[PDB]
């Protein structure tokens, strides 16, 4: 089997992308945030504390014929930018563009933080690192990509994210149309529960490439790419007016500005992200600073190649027995 779905930007600056889910029968389509850096799928529901919910689309499962509580089981979440939810759990059918899968534990928020609640247009995330992170307790459940591997053509999916403009989650196959040149495949360790690999280095602008290994996770579910601190200082550097601002939470830049691309390896391959790719647009509305789209991963604990890195390039998430994950150009 395969499956086939677009997700699409949420708002101008590419802060996250969403992507239609069915859920239950007669289907219930929620708009969830895929995210390879976390591993369970949950949503708003009716059984969100009312106070908490504000324009999401919720799933009811009280009016879907396959669902079933799963007695006992409760989860709780905490995301690294501080946002969390909790609740109960359900199993029940779960399609993502033509693929289905039954049985799929589907996590029902009692709690969401402000966040999420201040966030319309996210309706859940789906979780598709390994499910050695999923949260459900006293018994762990698995993602939807591991429920559904053994049934797919190959065991994969490719996330293929646009610059402000929709792009595509594929499971199952790899379309040789969405990619220019060769896929180059690299490591992957899931001792951490990540899609975790090593960069083999990188360059800013028309600068010489600096080989230098850089361990980070590729999560389809940050928004931005946070990078040890050398090489983040090594990038504003060519920006004249950047700095990193205290009070703003990272480095930002003269709105005047035209930014350098980044490029980073992958083995002896190279993804170059354009420089607009890396503009987030005004601090607050009517300023000239702008907010940069490569921050410090100092005190973050972990290297991320977010979107900023991620939609710069055609990536397959291999689930074979030895994980890899693949970047091409586009």
Known sequence: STGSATTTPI??????????????????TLNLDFDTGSSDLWVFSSET??????????YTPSKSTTAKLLSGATWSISYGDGSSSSGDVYTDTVSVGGLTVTGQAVESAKKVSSSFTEDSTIDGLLGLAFSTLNTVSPTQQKTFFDNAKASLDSPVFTADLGYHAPGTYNFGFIDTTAYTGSITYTAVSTKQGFWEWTS?????????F????????????????????????????????????????????????????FTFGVGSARIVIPGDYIDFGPISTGSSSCFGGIQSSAGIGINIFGDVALKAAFVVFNGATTPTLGFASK
């Open 49 to 58: 504390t009312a106070s908490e919910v504000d324009g999401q689309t919720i």
């Open 210 to 261: 600096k080989s230098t290994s850089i361990d980070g996770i590729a999560d389809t579910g940050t928004t931005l790419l946070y990078l040890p601190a050398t090489v983040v200082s090594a990038y504003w550097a060519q920006v004249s007016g950047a700095k990193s601002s205290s009070s703003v939470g990272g480095y930002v830049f003269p709105c005047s500005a035209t930014l350098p691309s």
């Open 200 to 208: 083999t280095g990188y360059a800013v602008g028309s600068g010489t």
């Open 11 to 28: 708002d101008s600056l590419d802060d996250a992308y969403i992507t239609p889910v069915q859920i239950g029968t007669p289907a219930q």
